[PDB]
Write a protein that binds this ligand. Structure first.
Ligand SMILES: *[C@@H]1O[C@H](CO[C@@H]2O[C@@H](C)[C@@H](O)[C@@H](O)[C@@H]2O)[C@@H](O)[C@H](O)[C@H]1NC(C)=O
Ligand SMILES: *[C@@H]1O[C@H](CO)[C@@H](O)[C@H](O)[C@H]1NC(C)=O
Ligand SMILES: *[C@@H]1O[C@H](CO)[C@@H](O)[C@H](O)[C@H]1NC(C)=O
Length: 321
């Protein structure tokens, strides 16, 4: 079970806040060129505005700045929050989606491009967006234009991502819905009609049937197979290992050990245990000992037999060394 959300702190070391292009250390910097991209490494929140103009990839000779290698973009795969706006005006052809932003989830929109835009994806040689993680575009309007071979962008119900009232969404002159559907570049079957960031089941706004981890799936593993799961708000989560997987019925009502049908080993109180407690330091700083009934029910053993137990009460306890 992936019961722990972040695992160790939040990532490897953990969360860092960096300034945006044209603000702070990147003052008087027009775009994210091959000079300041290295200062965005190990950074979860990039407060401010991000800019990727053609100058970054071409290289500006007069500012002693070099051309950007498309493999450097992966330095932004750690960014998930943008307090200002994201302005992407140029991106390579060897990549069909916004590869570097595969983990961006929240874009606030305090700062806006021309006081109107939060997301600007214009003139890009891509075929899909691939912003699978983006859940909220808080304020600014969205512009997606001049992306000749780009499909799937018109599918997204931007109303779900929007927060502020009247958020306009200029999605014009891309790869028409006529050609997109005729070539099989439509939203996935497992993907709900609420739009998708591409064809892959992971690229999805919401799931039509259910989800599991980072994918839209049809089955939830309730009645059979790999770890028996239960459905909670369109999500598949496996029942506690100490729950005998039942056929004809679902293995659990919830997440915990005490929320399942029947324990595969013994049963201490409401909890399903692999063995009855045999000398555990109890919450009252004292060793707790128990025994197993005929029906596998853990009962507290007699106080007299302290360093061990076999049956009920004060019966059988002197062992031969
Ligand atoms: C969505 O799921 C449909 C089946 O129904 C659902 O799944 C079964 C296993 C049961 O849990 C049932 O109670 C659910 O309502 C499929 O027929 C359908 O093909 C699925 N959709 C797609 C796009 O695959
Ligand atoms: C970035 O994080 C990785 C772990 O994900 C760590 O090994 C590395 O040293 C970090 N780099 C810097 C410059 O902090
Ligand atoms: C499954 O267990 C629940 C809980 O007691 C019960 O209400 C239901 O009738 C059972 N269904 C089957 C098919 O065993």
């Amino acid at each position: 079970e992936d019961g722990v959300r972040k695992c160790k702190k939040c990532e490897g070391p953990c969360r860092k806040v960096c300034n945006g292009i044209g603000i702070g250390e990147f003052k008087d910097s027009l775009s994210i060129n091959a000079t300041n991209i290295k200062h965005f490494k190990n950074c979860t929140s990039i407060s401010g505005d991000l800019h990727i103009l053609p100058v970054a990839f071409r290289g500006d000779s007069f500012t002693h700045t070099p051309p950007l290698d498309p493999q450097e973009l992966d330095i932004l795969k750690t960014v998930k929050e943008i307090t200002g706006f994201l302005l992407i005006q140029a991106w390579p052809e060897n990549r069909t989606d916004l590869h570097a932003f595969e983990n961006l989830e929240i874009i606030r929109g305090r700062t806006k491009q021309h006081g109107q835009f939060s997301l600007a994806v214009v003139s890009l040689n891509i075929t899909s967006l691939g912003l699978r993680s983006l859940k909220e575009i808080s304020d600014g309007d969205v512009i997606i234009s001049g992306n000749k071979n780009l499909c799937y962008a018109n599918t997204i119900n931007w109303k779900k991502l929007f927060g502020t009232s009247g958020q306009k969404t200029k999605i014009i002159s891309n790869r028409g819905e006529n050609s997109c559907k005729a070539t099989g570049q439509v939203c996935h079957a497992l993907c709900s009609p609420e739009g998708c960031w591409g064809p892959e089941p992971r690229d999805c706004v919401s799931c039509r049937n259910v989800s599991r981890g980072r994918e839209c799936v049809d089955k939830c593993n309730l009645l059979e197979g790999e770890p028996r799961e239960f459905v909670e708000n369109s999500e598949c989560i496996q029942c506690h290992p100490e729950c005998l997987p039942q056929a004809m019925n679902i293995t659990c009502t919830g997440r915990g050990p005490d929320n399942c049908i029947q324990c595969a080993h013994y049963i201490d109180g409401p909890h399903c245990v692999k063995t009855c407690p045999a000398g555990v330091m109890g919450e009252n700083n004292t060793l707790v000992w128990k025994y197993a009934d005929a029906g596998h029910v853990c009962h507290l053993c007699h106080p007299n037999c302290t360093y061990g137990c076999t049956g009920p009460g004060l019966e059988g306890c002197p062992t031969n060394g």
